[PDB]
Amino acid sequence: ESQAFQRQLTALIGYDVTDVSNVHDDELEFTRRGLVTPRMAEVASRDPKLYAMHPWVTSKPLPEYLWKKIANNCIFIVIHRTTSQTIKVSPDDTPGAILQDFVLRVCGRDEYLVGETPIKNFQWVRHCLKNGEEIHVVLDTPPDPALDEVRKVSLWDCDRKFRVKIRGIDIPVTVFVEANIQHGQQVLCQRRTSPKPFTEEVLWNVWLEFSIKIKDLPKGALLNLQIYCQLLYYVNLLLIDHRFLLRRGEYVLHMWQISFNADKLTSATNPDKENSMSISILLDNYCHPIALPKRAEMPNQLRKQLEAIIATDPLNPLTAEDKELLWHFRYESLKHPKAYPKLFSSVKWGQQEIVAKTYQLLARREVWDQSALDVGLTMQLLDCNFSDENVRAIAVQKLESLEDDDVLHYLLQLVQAVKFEPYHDSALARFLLKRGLRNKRIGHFLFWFLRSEIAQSRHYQQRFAVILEAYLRGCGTAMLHDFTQQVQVIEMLQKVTLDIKSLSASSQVISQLKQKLENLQNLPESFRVPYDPGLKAGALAIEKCKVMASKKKPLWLEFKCADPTALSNETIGIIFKHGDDLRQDMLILQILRIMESIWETESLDLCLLPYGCISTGDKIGMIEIVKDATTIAKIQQKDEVLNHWLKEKSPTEEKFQAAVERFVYSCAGYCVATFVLGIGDRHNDNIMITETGNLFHIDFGHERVPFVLTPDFLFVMGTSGTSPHFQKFQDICVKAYLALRHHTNLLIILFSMMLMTGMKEDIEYIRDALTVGKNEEDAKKYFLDQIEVCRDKGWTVQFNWF
Ligand SMILES: Cn1c(=O)n(C2CCOCC2)c2c3cc(-c4cccnc4)ccc3ncc21
């Protein structure tokens, strides 16, 4: 009756929030309760007119390469209604001024040109100008905002030393327990139990007295229990709870097994109980509830020493002297926003006094607030190394400066960063709740970015599910309708992918596929595309649908577009795959999209193709089909072969000369990008190219060479084992490489988090690849040398690949 809505949300999320069986406290229920207010606040504050039409706009400057297309200076936008007419408009002209009521929707898209924004500052206008396409719009009627209607004793006096009683470890099928007090990645104090023979049950009943006191336990503290026999099981328990109270009583904790990592920081217990390892522990209880309460300059030499510490890379660890230097002169270090991550590492979190000294130091934020926004440091303070609620919130406060365009560039990386938050309700989760609820595009990607983890991560599904339910409860009836239509389709397409895979390691398979898709089309008739929400896919082209030939078996699906106002009847091609982890490809594609923005600021377009890719469920998702594209393997199935393929598929010579240029930029782009990320040693079948000349890597799901610059690519430029194109390539390569190096800290910390949340020494790769330390001229030469490593090898490495 009154519960029907929750069972609808339950099916959208893919996990039950009301079901509380793997919970030892009430944090999820308390954060479900606490999340109501920032949803109520956002639902109410959003302009219902601009919420319904979600104009995807930017406040960033129009790039160098895009002002080349505009001349007079005017742009042509063709308005449709059967009868169409072109209108010459100034780049700085508002959409209403063009209209001279009615709205300017994009043809075949739920994309609109609205608000007090210049047309040059629209993401669809910039997109068309980049791709050299016409701006086809339609004089449509604004959508009803009615469709989005939303349904409605003190701690610092407990000077006693802390202790935990290790009762034992009950397991269904030598060993010792390692008890740790943790804050960030920094272990405060360790204690082990005496080794005992490994059996079905191992009792100890011994108390482990720690060096740290109750008073000195920081908000965010963790009792991390580990089972060593060398590490085999782990579990965590927040010593300070959500209601600021120290943990008391008996706790049985089901432990996570093994095979550093974000999964190893989780406060959640293992849901499996009949097969998992447990741990009975006792925590000292009291009659009254224990509750946590709330100059000189610097000499020229010690200034230079501190300046060198700030200027180093994030991965560079601080010594004991570096930590003392930074802490003593914290008031100076506070006047340099770049020192904050390193300074907040230098503080002794296991000392109530040193913590209180930081908390009051942070009240002098006049300098941090007034600073120019840096995503680098903001992401730095949100990682595993920072467990303090206050420090993290200073980073979340800067995320408010980010306009909807930028929130989209880091939505996935911010969603992952929630894994490092000690408590469920956090400034970050709330931040992602505001931005998702304010914007429909952000909200759509939020849904899928959260649903990605809820369905595959047993470690963080609990936390993420309460954040999804909170977003869902405020998006409005329209988005809730759209998501049911997406869930219903992917859940339908999930069975088909799995049933077909359970028939192969042919005509039988291809007939059985259409035999199943037939009893599927007879709901829904339309659904938004999870990786491109503007595009609405209609009914299937069941005759075009096939099962793909590789080691894995994906579903090549083609859907007609639901919008009849579309320019072409070109179907929407979607790959539905199983057995591969799309969570890592999502992460790689995101850094690629970030790299492009870095190049945009530096006035460069390296023509990357970061194809839509959404992780949907348990090792299953969907991938965008790139139209008129094939792999290098299919083009070979040597030197001449690619340039012969480009001319052959090219209509005019004008278009071919465009095809070789689109090749040099995209090739240089994938050369710099895949090198930095360390995914350049890839097989020919994992490198694609459009009939337009647009090259792009794929299958990112986890002798040597730095990148792929084979002779067939070189022959396209006009070189065999210099050229006017190869010189243009080398120059744009360096120009692109040096741009990414200006954002070292950003890339370093983006990669670091990517590793921990998606997948110590492995991370160190970007230090060397982004040539940390070396000057602008030394890096130019270093990259040009890596070009020559590909020239020397040629077909060697490509041949080596089995
Ligand atoms: C025409 N055509 C293909 O043949 N294929 C492939 C199918 C699987 O064998 C490799 C080639 C693709 C595409 C494959 C991906 C992709 C698939 C899995 C992982 N990462 C990326 C993306 C876009 C694509 N577009 C077009 C297209």
UniProtKB/Swiss-Prot annotation:
Stated EC number for the protein is 2.7.1.137, 2.7.1.153, 2.7.1.154, 2.7.11.1
Annotated stretches, region: G-loop: 547-553
According to the record, mutating residue 741 to P results in: In IMD97; loss of phosphatidylinositol-3,4-bisphosphate 5-kinase activity
Q: What is this protein called?
A: Phosphatidylinositol 4,5-bisphosphate 3-kinase catalytic subunit gamma isoform
Provenance organism: Homo sapiens
Name the reported effect of residue 800 to S: In IMD97; loss-of-function variant unable to rescue reduced T-cell activation when expressed in Jurkat PIK3CG-deficient cells
Q: Which gene encodes it?
A: PIK3CG
Q: Where is the C2 PI3K-type domain?
A: 158-284
Q: How does it assemble?
A: Heterodimer of a catalytic subunit PIK3CG and a PIK3R5 or PIK3R6 regulatory subunit. Interacts with GRK2 through the PIK helical domain. Interaction with GRK2 is required for targeting to agonist-occupied receptor. Interacts with PDE3B; regulates PDE3B activity and thereby cAMP levels in cells. Interacts with TPM2. Interacts with EPHA8; regulates integrin-mediated cell adhesion to substrate. Interacts with HRAS; the interaction is required for membrane recruitment and beta-gamma G protein dimer-dependent activation of the PI3K gamma complex PIK3CG:PIK3R6.
The chain residues annotated with the modification Phosphothreonine are 744
What does the record give as the function of this protein?
A: Phosphoinositide-3-kinase (PI3K) that phosphorylates PtdIns(4,5)P2 (Phosphatidylinositol 4,5-bisphosphate) to generate phosphatidylinositol 3,4,5-trisphosphate (PIP3). PIP3 plays a key role by recruiting PH domain-containing proteins to the membrane, including AKT1 and PDPK1, activating signaling cascades involved in cell growth, survival, proliferation, motility and morphology. Links G-protein coupled receptor activation to PIP3 production. Involved in immune, inflammatory and allergic responses. Modulates leukocyte chemotaxis to inflammatory sites and in response to chemoattractant agents.
GO biological process assignments:
adaptive immune response; angiogenesis; cell migration; cellular response to cAMP; dendritic cell chemotaxis; endocytosis; G protein-coupled receptor signaling pathway; hepatocyte apoptotic process
Disease association reads: Immunodeficiency 97 with autoinflammation: An autosomal recessive disorder with variable features. Affected individuals have childhood-onset antibody defects, cytopenias, and T lymphocytic pneumonitis and colitis. Some patients may have features of hemophagocytic lymphohistiocytosis.
